[PDB]
Design a protein around this ligand. Structure first.
Ligand SMILES: *CC[C@H](OP(*)(=O)O)[C@H](O)COP(=O)(O)O
Length: 319
DNA sequence: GTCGG
DNA sequence: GCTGATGCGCC
DNA sequence: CCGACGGCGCATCAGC
């Protein structure tokens, strides 16, 4: 219902981010596209859509146009602009943002063919993003994710028994498909006050699960992983993996945050805000009488964060 | 672009 | 060689 | 009428 509208808005969002480099317009168009996608009727007028929050004068007036003519004049102009369309396409490559995209097209590099021809002009990330272009646009069915999980959990257990690995994102909420694999990592040895990630990455490279490294440091890893070929069947497609080392006293605040979604956290952060607590990626802290966030509270589980704000626990399933 | 002080 | 700015991706 | 809208880890480059 109203799919033609939500497409038009997503198409404009991508344009403002990649071509215009107007990030706040991109977020506004997304917000408008998301609300209209949730709406349980067929929008027949821009004035109707305007009642929904995140829809204003301008979007209402291009909804009036789309419903009347069956297309948008501004987008028809952009789709037949060589610069705009090319810049949009290049940014689909991981490591190519709006800056790199613009510079490439300015020196006559527009297509994957042109990127392969000129691999000497790309950094490490962009080369890998090019290598696994199609494999990264593929979704991951929940079946594959469970096999990927067991390997990680097992391999981490082999390195040290005291490691606590939790796979979050769409997967933990019980979604039938996920985009990437976001793993959280902690260890009794590592707190806020008092080579943990290295040896785990080193181990998962040794059993040929992790194939490539996009970035790595003390606390955070981003790379590429692959399930082992059954041999009888065709080899599995390469997936994006993110391993994140978090202090022990900030794990469940980390888990809660990275379990999602964008709306749930915003709603929980908003509810918590007025009840007299400020929660973020790291901690839950009480606000003083003067609206001053003091010392962080202790957290033993996700449940404790719900206990503090007297909000009834919502299992990852229902978020 | 839309919102809210 | 160092330190700070900037690009990129990201609940 | 006009500023806020995401703050951060890592890779890379500009400036010295
Ligand atoms: C489409 C309307 C746009 O609204 P904004 O707050 O960037 C602009 O007015 C540009 O319109 P266009 O020239 O028709 O794209």
């Amino acid at each position: 219902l109203n799919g033609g509208i939500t497409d038009m808005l997503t198409e404009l969002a991508n344009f403002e981010k990649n071509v215009s480099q107007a990030i706040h317009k991109y977020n506004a168009y997304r917000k408008a596209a998301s609300v209209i996608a949730k709406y349980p009727h067929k929008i027949k007028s821009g004035a109707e859509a305007k009642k929904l929050p995140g829809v204003g004068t301008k979007i209402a007036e291009k909804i009036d146009e789309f419903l009347a003519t069956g297309k948008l004049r501004k987008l028809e102009k952009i789709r037949q602009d060589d610069t705009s369309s090319s810049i949009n396409f290049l940014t689909r490559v991981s490591g190519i943002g709006p800056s790199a995209a613009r510079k490439f097209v300015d020196e006559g590099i527009k297509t994957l063919e042109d990127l392969r021809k000129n691999e000497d002009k790309l950094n490490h990330h962009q080369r890998i993003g090019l290598k696994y272009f199609g494999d990264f646009e593929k979704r991951i069915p929940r079946e594959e994710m469970l096999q990927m999980q067991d390997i990680v959990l097992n391999e981490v257990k082999k390195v040290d028994s005291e490691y606590i690995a939790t796979v979050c994102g769409s997967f933990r909420r019980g979604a039938e498909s996920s985009g990437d694999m976001d793993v959280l990592l902690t260890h009794p040895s590592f707190t806020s006050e008092s080579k943990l990630l290295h040896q785990v990455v080193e181990q998962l490279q040794k059993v040929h699960f992790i194939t490539d490294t996009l970035s790595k440091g003390e606390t955070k890893f981003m790379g590429v992983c692959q399930l082992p070929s059954k041999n009888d069947e065709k080899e599995y497609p390469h997936r994006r993996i993110d391993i994140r080392l978090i202090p022990k006293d900030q794990y469940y605040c980390g888990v809660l945050y990275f379990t999602g979604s964008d709306i749930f956290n915003k709603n929980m952060r908003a509810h918590a805000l007025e009840k007299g607590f400020t929660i973020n990626e790291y901690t839950i802290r009480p606000l003083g009488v003067t609206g001053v966030a003091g010392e962080p509270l202790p957290v033993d589980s996700e449940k404790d964060i719900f206990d503090y704000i007297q909000w009834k626990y919502r299992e990852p399933k229902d978020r």
